[PDB]
């Protein structure tokens, strides 16, 4: 098997969608997967994301259900540390009393961290394990959910929907459209302000739209580049040469040691940006 085929296989997702003969079946080739329209699902991404979210929620439910209100145990001390950190972060950014912001920030941070963490495992372990368990050698399986633009886009779109919902809730459709078309530049007379509404819309709508796109792409680019560089280094081992493999080990170790920082930092940035975006939807910044 060639290195190019190795990379091409590693770059493909497990897709379930509408075959020409019915709305049931898994794609066996990249072309067949791309033939499926918008109504298809990446099974590996959704499965891993739901599994990791369920694991995190179960672990945090175990400590919360038996809160001692005294000397904390080993697990609930860690849970309290995380909750205190999230609460301190929320208090320094958001001055309202919305109960949704803090649990949302905690969920976002821990979920994204857990999704990024599985990139540190060797690239060939989980796909080969899945191939052996299912018995199919040519099985598409990608573990890291955050390297799929669909997951990051879903997170960013849900955050954007929350932004719009809370802005409308706290300002009426009236104040929402007013802030979108009239606020940054205002005039005492009607004729000037009418000429100003296109400028205000052009300045506000672009910045409003750019938020979910940046939120998704900042995470996606970092995770995708990290996984792709991890895949490329594995090819150096595949050459079988002594010299090339020795350098590959050092490169992989350095990349992982650098990548743990990126894994933590991207989740922290996503949490902070979500908090900031939700806080500026309850106030007026222009």
């Amino acid at each position: 098997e060639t290195a190019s085929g190795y990379i091409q296989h590693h770059l493909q997702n497990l897709t379930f969608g509408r075959l020409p003969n019915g709305d049931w079946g898994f794609a066996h080739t990249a072309e067949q997967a791309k033939e499926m329209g918008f109504w298809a699902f990446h099974v590996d991404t959704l499965g891993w994301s739901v599994l990791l979210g369920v694991v995190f929620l179960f672990i945090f439910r175990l400590a919360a259900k038996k809160a001692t209100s005294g000397q904390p145990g080993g697990l609930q001390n860690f849970v309290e540390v995380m909750v205190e950190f999230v609460d301190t972060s929320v208090k320094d950014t958001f001055h309202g009393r919305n109960p949704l912001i803090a649990p949302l920030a905690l969920t976002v941070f821990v979920w994204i961290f857990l999704l990024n963490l599985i990139d540190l495992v060797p690239v060939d372990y989980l796909p080969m394990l899945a191939a052996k368990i299912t018995g199919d050698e040519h099985l598409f399986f990608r573990a890291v959910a955050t390297t799929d633009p669909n997951a990051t886009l879903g997170l960013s779109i849900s955050v954007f929907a929350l932004i719009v919902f809370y802005s409308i809730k706290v300002k009426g459709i009236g104040g929402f459209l007013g802030e979108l078309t009239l606020h940054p530049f205002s005039s005492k007379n009607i004729v000037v302000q009418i000429l100003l509404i296109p400028v205000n819309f052009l300045l506000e709508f672009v910045t409003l739209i750019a938020k979910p796109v940046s939120l998704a792409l900042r995470l996606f680019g970092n995770m995708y580049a990290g996984e792709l560089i991890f895949i490329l280094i594995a090819v150096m081992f595949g050459s079988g040469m002594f010299l090339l493999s020795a350098l590959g080990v050092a490169l992989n170790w350095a990349w992982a040691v650098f990548h743990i920082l990126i894994i933590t930092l991207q989740a922290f940035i996503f949490m902070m940006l979500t908090i900031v975006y939700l806080s500026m939807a309850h106030e007026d910044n222009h």
């Binding site: 298809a40 919360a64 849900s158």
Partner: protein, 47 residues
């Protein structure tokens, strides 16, 4: 690359997880922390 309905499944899972955390995780831990702080304050006001 390939935009799919995974974009919808991820948002559904996200909302479900956030609604779980809002009701069954955060309040008990916050209440325990506040009760411990109240106990410490009362012990410091015993004078």
């Amino acid at each position: 690359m390939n935009i799919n309905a995974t974009l919808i499944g991820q948002s559904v899972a996200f909302f479900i997880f956030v609604l779980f955390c809002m009701k069954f995780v955060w309040p008990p831990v916050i209440a325990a922390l506040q009760e411990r702080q109240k106990k410490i304050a009362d012990g410091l006001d015993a004078a």
